[PDB]
Structure 1
């Protein structure tokens, strides 16, 4: 039930330009809502500002596809 949602989250993140994998995804229910935290991989040669833009793009992409999510935080690490 949750694994199906986790899979949809990872797939949505991986379709955003600049994502080099999902390093980490924590997702849990608060009532019927999902609260999640994730770390994406990015090109180490991207700027801090570009990494920020990719994170934002993932947040928007994931939240737009998975409507039960009411909190999502995305950070980036080199990969």
Structure 2
């Protein structure tokens, strides 16, 4: 029953400047810890550097709000 935690991850991610939706989220329990992988949408006209910064901001925001997450990998794809 991972809906509640995944809902929290998505909402946290979406509240970060530059996030155009969560394209993909795979979360799994490793013991009582969550390890996750996420792909966010970003403006196709952002620079690669900006997209990297937005990914780092999502990582901080999400990990800050969901204490059980012990690994979170965030990548980005162009989204209009």
For Structure 1 versus Structure 2, the TM-score category normalised by the shorter chain is over 0.9
Shift of 1:13: 0.2
3-state secondary structure, aligned to 2:39 = strand
Shift of 1:72: 0.2
Alignment match, 1:34: 34
Deviations 1:40-78 (A, max 9, x none): 000000000000000000000000000000000000000
Shift of 1:23: 0.2
Deviations 1:16-61 (A, max 9, x none): 0000000000000000000000000000000000000000000000
TM-score by length of 1: 0.99
1: distance between equivalents of 2:38 and 2:20? 13
Structure 1: unaligned runs, 5 residues or longer: none
Shift of 1:2: 1.1
3-state secondary structure, aligned to 1:16 = coil
Runs of 4 or more off by more than 3 Å in structure 1? Answer: none
Q: CA RMSD in A?
A: 0.4
